[PDB]
């Protein structure tokens, strides 16, 4: 299945997804709570329970909502600024900060 897609992994994957739980929190609260509205609102949707949560475009579940656009952007962009801050391009990564120092 597939041919080495960004580190071939199945279960462990989740693990790799864990690394940075906090980051996942801020990212979430960030997306979800894109503003000062989420509490009461969340209480509303919750109170509703089973309403539709469907969009006339994809169908339902697995990507559903404008957030999608954010997924594509934040996806590439994010991963970008990410790895970027990490290494640069398949090489030199993971370390006590090691961007591009004055080396010769």
What total number of domains does the chain contain? 1
N-term to C-term CA, the chain = 43
How far from the centroid of its chain's Cα atoms is residue 66's Cα? Answer: 15
d(Cα 91, Cα 12) in Å, to the nearest integer? 22
How far from the centroid of its chain's Cα atoms is residue 22's Cα? Answer: 12
* CA-to-CA dists, residue 47 to 24, 28, 51, 53, 60, angstroms: 26, 21, 10, 14, 20
CATH number of the structural domain spanning residue 54: 6.10.110.10
Which pair of structure tokens corresponds to residue 18? 């864990």
**Token pair 């279960």 is at which residue?**
11
DSSP conformational letter for 78: I
Which pair of structure tokens corresponds to residue 67? 């957030």
d(Cα 72, Cα 31) in Å, to the nearest integer? 13
Q: Which domain holds residue 85?
A: 11-94
Which pair of structure tokens corresponds to residue 64? 């559903």
Q: What is the DSSP string of 31-43?
A: HHTSSS-SHHHHH
Specify if 87 maps to a domain.
yes
Number of Cβ atoms within 10 Å of the Cβ of 64: 14
Query: What is the rounded radius of gyration, in angstroms, for the C-alpha atoms of the chain?
Result: 18
CA-closest candidate to residue 78, choices 27, 35, 10, 29: 27
Specify if 5 maps to a domain.
no
């Amino acid at each position: 299945m597939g041919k080495e897609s960004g580190w071939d992994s199945g279960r462990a994957a989740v693990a790799a997804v864990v690394g940075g739980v906090v980051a996942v929190g801020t990212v979430l609260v960030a997306l979800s709570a894109m503003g000062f509205t989420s509490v009461g609102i969340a209480a509303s949707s919750i109170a509703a329970k089973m309403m539709s949560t469907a969009a006339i475009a994809n169908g339902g579940g697995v990507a559903a909502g404008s957030l999608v656009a954010i997924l594509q952007s934040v996806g590439a962009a994010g991963l970008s600024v990410t790895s970027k801050v990490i290494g640069g391009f398949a090489g030199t990564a993971l370390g006590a900060w090691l961007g591009s120092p004055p080396s010769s």
